[PDB]
Amino acid sequence: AMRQCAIYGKGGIGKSTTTQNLVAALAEMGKKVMIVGCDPKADSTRLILHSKAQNTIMEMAAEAGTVEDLELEDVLKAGYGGVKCVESGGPEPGVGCAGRGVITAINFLEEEGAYEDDLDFVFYDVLGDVVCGGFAMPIRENKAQEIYIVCSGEMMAMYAANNISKGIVKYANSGSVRLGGLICNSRNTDREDELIIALANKLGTQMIHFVPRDNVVQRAEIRRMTVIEYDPKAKQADEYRALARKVVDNKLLVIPNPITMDELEELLMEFG
Template sequence: MRKIAFYGKGGIGKSTTASNVSAALSLMGKRVCQIGCDPKNDSTRLLLGHICKSTVLDMLRTKDAGDIQKEDIIHTGFHGVTCVEAGGPEPGVGCAGRGIIVALELLDRMKALPESDVVLYDVLGDVVCGGFAMPIREGYAEEIYIVSSGELMSLYAANNIAKGIARFASRGKVRLAGIIGNSRNVPGEKELLIEFAERLHTGLAAFIPRDRTVNLAENHRQTVLQYAPDSQQAEVYRKLAETILTNEAESIPTPISFDELENLVAQYGTEN
């Protein structure tokens, strides 16, 4: 079983990318489980066609752990993709990162996850909280892809995630598998992401162009693979899924300083 996690700055498009990759993998015949580790519980929206109505933490607020059944927290999405949302605390109450810990521990105790070829964790943030680092720290995920654009703060978050991966790599199997560029149409973006990946001692797994098809699919609560399967954008996600399945270029990342990062971004912004 492949254990993969997508990390990146909030709002960078992790959930959209994860859902389209999950859909593509499923259409390729793989048994896929996507686990949303974001308190907004919207990771699997495009696969389910709606916001998940029953997260793990929702169930724990209404039932004793021993009374929760697998069907309470495991849902089936597009083309049979298994969908789970960890959920989060009520707004303004509690720690969202702690919610991930509780949810994943419960799934483990229940042996709730079906047999899968690929388990894909969609994780919020840049590993500043122990809860969000849990998929890396506890070995739930071994292959980490960082979703980033060419914008400075997105790259800053990516660099922080690389620091977290490097820290935990010394005591486990976790490795950086690549950068996924989710374009924001900034100057020299693809070239910048390629060089940024090289400095982190990894590669650019994919460069996803900014395309209105993605927005249209999201408005219909669908992945691009479902909404526009013959589109060029769908093919981009298929190629990314194929890359993930065949990728063996995993590494312990080498994060850079913020000064080096600023200079790198300025260099590409100036040249273009």
């Protein structure tokens, strides 16, 4: 068995930083993990690979002729802790559907045997500003059974979490895609942890961890590293270890209860 997990959330909220640091902490424990980048920015693996980014399946297929000319060894790259990394890519802006590379990539990985048995986790890092096209495909086609949403006390971040939750509800009659929890990426505002706990309870899920805002993240990423690799003794490294522990231990996977705009506004007013 392997646990197939997808990280969703609005752009800029911290998906790729949180995912790569979470995954580094899992590899540090001895878990075997693969990260599949599903965001057109295509930098979801650079901290594991110590890289600028990673060349995408869309790009490589175009240079080789067809996706079928590609081999798994050409596409999958191993970084920190042996974590395996791949990027979907997407069409250039204004051309096509921005999510179409996600469909190509996941299908390639499945057929080429990337989901080999002693993998323990696969994480998809998915753009969540719209839930359509290839960005909905991990939910629609039952690829990621456990959805974790990165958010913060930002109204736009909570709206994105609600929108993703609506997509999960839409496909609950098929497959087994469920909401696993919210991850608060702190804006260093007062009572933010309480706000995201309250939101999670209204959705029917939990706040699985509160990630502090810590400048060590920037210092690590400037050097193309996770905090786990850059400074294993940092306070923030222990935070990502705590998140990883709670993700491994999590048993609550629900069909969420999306909330109305009135409830969101009441949350923000209530917690000041």
